[PDB]
Curated annotation (Swiss-Prot):
Record's protein name: Lysine-specific histone demethylase 1A
UniProt PTM: Acetylated by KAT8 in epithelial but not in mesenchymal cells, thereby regulating the epithelial-to-mesenchymal transition. Acetylation by KAT8 reduces KDM1A association with nucleosomes, thereby decreasing histone H3 demethylation, leading to transcription activatio of target genes.
Record text about domains: The SWIRM domain may act as an anchor site for a histone tail.
Signal peptide: none
Length: 49
DNA sequence: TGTCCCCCGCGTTTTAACCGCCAAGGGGATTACTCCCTAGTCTCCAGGCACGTGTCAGATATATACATCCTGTGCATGTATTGAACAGCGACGAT
């Protein structure tokens, strides 16, 4: 890309926190298995706590 | 047009050309004499030329490979141009 190199003066985490506005995110949820078949998918996940 | 040098002109130095006169024999010119050689003449015939003929060395036509002659691509390199990334200075608000 052209131009100079720039930084985020106030921490770059302001982007993903703003992008998460209005979404249905399941925090503290680790995925174990991922099942995929011809008629659908099934995701097995557990709680990190 | 521009340079460098190669002759031209001129004074002074060096050489032998030129003339005048004598001394000598080498060789060319001239004559007299003899015979060997060539022009002229005749007869004899084959060497040389015209004429005819047969054919292969060479000119002609047509197809291909070789040479070359010149212009147009490429390359490479240097240079010019432009964009970008270092560098102000000052006014403002936040601390």
């Amino acid at each position: 890309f052209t131009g100079s190199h720039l930084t985020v003066r106030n921490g770059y985490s302001c982007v993903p926190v703003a992008l998460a506005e209005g979404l249905d995110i399941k925090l503290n949820t680790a995925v174990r298995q991922v099942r995929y078949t011809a008629s659908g998918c099934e995701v097995i996940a557990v709680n990190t706590a």
